């Protein structure tokens, strides 16, 4: 086994039923070594006695809380965890793929090393997250991540609507407009019930920037059927403009990026003549094949 | 005196013929103690006995490679240089001054943080060529330098064609759209057989930037009296053009940015009429005044 924390560990078992489990030694860490009992959570009453018990684990039910007792009082607690491994393959029975089949989708609206990564849950009962870089060495990308939350956004499936989980990181080495040499090597640790599973990815910021919608979009009607369109952009983009600059995508309708059809300007502005629709807008980074903003819509309304 | 790699030391000698020189040890680095002697490349023979060899040094006849000797063998060498100073002021005597009466001209063809910088010599015979960061401190810039190397192009001036020594160098931290706040700091340690001299040069990046010359200059002839040219950014020059724009010069001949007649484009293409003669353009950074690069030229025909 292996230590996560202070009296939290994670043993390694192979789940395939023909083999056999790990035996794992649990000292109590007191001075004492004598009249030392074993309480766990799993399995009520004592079931060891000893300064070092030894145990088998192959079932959820040999992990838990292993509590010592001593004349009726406790001493020391240490907590067991499990990480499957069948066929030689590691557990991700906690999180749930998107359609791609990866699980960990990070974004970042604009070069400031700050990003958001986000994933799905199977259930959502006694979880608990942490998320590091996985990488942690000379040659490395330094990112703090803050705490994981429930975005209050469900997202659909085949048929089931499964919950995400958003975080929120930054680098701390940035300088924006440096070309990235090495990926940010991120790790999930996810923790259920007892359930121990991690999760890696490897990004670069420049290719999961997903800029925002343009902000004040103006729909000014200019001639009987003409009507001037603006925009700027997006407070959250980096500045200076004149190095990350967006292209813009205009589209009109009768009430990742998806392109089907769309005509491009490149200036914060455009004339359109619609009567009647709505006219759409969104924005990429000009010179990479970046993710597409969300459309920002106003309706065609004519004077 | 003072170290500078093994074995190899540097003597502060002021020149002046009226001041004494500077007596300096030399202890031969063997346990033995006793059957030492020293053998100098100036003076053939044996010049002293003992382990330690104290001797007065001020002209370079007191200088090169001391050689220990002890029952037929040698033990242990030490080299001297010598940094003359005369009205106490440092020699600047092995290499050639430029126009601008510099001795380090560095250019920089864009903002990557590579530069290169040469240097002119007097003469070429056993020279020995080093540079780095002369602050190599907190608040400095990082920047890793190659090895120097003779240019196949001289350098003429007045009537003497003087080899040019160049070498390439890159800065570190590169963060582009930053402003510069604190200048490269740059030092040449230059040796010739026993003269130790060094120079020093500050600059920033976006000083010393000279671009290519515009690429692929195209002559298209118009309708009845003109002719467009058109031209590209040089492929040298940096991303994005956005960011990065040049301003160009174009003028037209029958035959640092130097200017008997040109007008301004800020395109990459402009019609003139010119039937016959040369039409030519240089780039510079539109943003500062940067060295223009030189003068790419097609012939109006
Ligand atoms: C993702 O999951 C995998 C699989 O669970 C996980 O790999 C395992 O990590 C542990 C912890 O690093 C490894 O355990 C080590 O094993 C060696 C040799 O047996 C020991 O020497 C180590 O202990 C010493 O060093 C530690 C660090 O200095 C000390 O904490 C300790 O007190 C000892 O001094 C340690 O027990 C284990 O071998 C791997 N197993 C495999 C097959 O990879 C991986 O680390 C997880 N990553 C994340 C980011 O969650
Ligand atoms: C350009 O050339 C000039 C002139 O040669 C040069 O100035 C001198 O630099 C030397 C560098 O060694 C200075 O010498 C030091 O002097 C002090 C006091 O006397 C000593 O303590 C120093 O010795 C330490 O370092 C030795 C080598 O590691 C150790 O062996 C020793 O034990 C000490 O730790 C050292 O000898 C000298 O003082 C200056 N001159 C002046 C006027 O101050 C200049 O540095 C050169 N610059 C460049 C960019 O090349
Ligand atoms: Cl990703």
Same mark, same amino acid.
């Given at each position: ?11 390694? @078992? ?6 056999? !489990?790990?035996? @794992?030694?649990?000292? %109590? ?20 006695? !000893? ?10 039910? =040999?992990? +838990?809380?292993?509590? %010592?007792?001593? !004349? +009726? ?43 958001? %990564? ?42 089931? =609507? ?10 701390? @080495? ?52 003409? @009507? ?76």
């Amino acid at each position: 086994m292996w230590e996560l924390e202070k009296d939290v560990y994670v043993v390694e @078992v192979d789940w395939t039923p023909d083999a056999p !489990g790990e035996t @794992v030694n649990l000292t %109590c860490d007191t001075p004492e070594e004598d009249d030392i009992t074993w309480t766990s959570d799993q399995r009520h009453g004592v079931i060891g006695s !000893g300064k070092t018990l030894t145990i088998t684990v192959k079932e959820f039910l =040999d992990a +838990g809380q292993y509590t %010592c007792h001593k !004349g +009726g009082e406790t001493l020391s607690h240490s907590h067991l965890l499990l990480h499957k491994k069948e066929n030689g393959i590691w557990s991700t029975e906690i999180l749930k793929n998107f359609k791609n089949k990866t699980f960990l989708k990070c974004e970042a609206p604009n070069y400031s090393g700050r990003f958001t %990564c986000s994933w799905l849950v199977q259930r959502n009962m006694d979880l608990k997250f942490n998320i590091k870089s996985s990488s942690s060495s000379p040659d490395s990308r330094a990112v703090t991540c803050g705490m994981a939350s429930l975005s209050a956004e469900k997202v659909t499936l085949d048929q089931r =609507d499964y919950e995400k989980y958003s975080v929120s990181c930054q680098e701390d @080495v940035t300088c924006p407009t440096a070309e990235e040499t090495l990926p940010i090597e991120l790790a999930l640790e996810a923790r259920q019930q007892n359930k121990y599973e991690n999760y890696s990815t490897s990004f670069f910021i420049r290719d999961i920037i997903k800029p925002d919608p343009p902000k004040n979009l103006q729909m000014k009607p200019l001639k009987n059927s003409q @009507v001037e369109v603006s925009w700027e952009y997006p407070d959250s983009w980096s500045t200076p403009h004149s190095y990350f600059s967006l292209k813009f995508f205009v589209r009109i309708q009768r009430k990742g990026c998806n392109q089907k059809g769309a005509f491009l300007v490149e200036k914060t502005s455009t004339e359109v003549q619609c009567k009647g629709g709505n006219v759409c807008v969104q924005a990429q980074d000009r010179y990479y094949n970046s993710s597409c903003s969300k459309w920002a819509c106003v309706p065609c309304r004519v004077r």
